[PDB]
Amino acid sequence: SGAIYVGNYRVVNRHLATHNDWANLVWEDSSRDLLVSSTTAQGCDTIARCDCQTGVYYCSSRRKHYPVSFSKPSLIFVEASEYYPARYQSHLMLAVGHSEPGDCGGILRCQHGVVGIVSTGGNGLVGFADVRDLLWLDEE
Ligand SMILES: CSc1cscc1CC(=O)N1CC(C(N)=O)C1
Numbered sequence: 520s521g522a523i524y525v526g527n528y529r530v531v532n533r534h535l536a537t538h539n540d541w542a543n544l545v546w547e548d549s550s551r552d553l554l555v556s557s558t559t560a561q562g563c564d565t566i567a568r569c570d571c572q573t574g575v576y577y578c579s580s581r582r583k584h585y586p587v588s589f590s591k592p593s594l595i596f597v598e599a600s601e602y603y604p605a606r607y608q609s610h611l612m613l614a615v616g617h618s619e620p621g622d623c624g625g626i627l628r629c630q631h632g633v634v635g636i637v638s639t640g641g642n643g644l645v646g647f648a649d650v651r652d653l654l655w656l657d658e659e
């Protein structure tokens with residue numbers, strides 16, 4: 520589990536969105552595994568606006584933050600989990616790192632701010648849904 524809190528937005532994995540998220544929906548995209556809902560309180564996270572390929576992510580199944588090198592956001596075919604079939608997920612970045620299903624939620628960050636959240640993985644992989652192209656998260 521986990522979310523990004525920027526401005527009056529809450530960014531979560533679409534497959535972990537709650538009823539309150541769907542009832543206060545701003546935007547969702549199943550191909551990216553992302554959903555954004557509105558919040559009453561302002562958040563403290565800042566979104567990175569950069570092309571970093573190195574950063575650090577949080578792994579809840581190890582209670583640890585790991586430094587990683589990650590690929591550029593791309594269209595990557597994903598093994599069908601409990602929420603999606605085998606499929607192509609867009610705007611996904613891969614890195615070598617431990618992950619288990621509950622880890623969806625964990626932030627990947629660089630020196631500029633939040634880069635994305637954990638979304639897919641396995642066998643020492645972990646995939647992050649990028650958010651750096653969602654410029655509207657910084658306004659309104
Ligand atoms: C970090 S996800 C992961 C680590 S080991 C196996 C998995 C894969 C998994 O169970 N999925 C991916 C997620 C989705 N986006 O639907 C649900």
Ligand SMILES: [Zn+2]
Nearest residue numbers: 569571629631
């Ligand atoms: Zn950066």
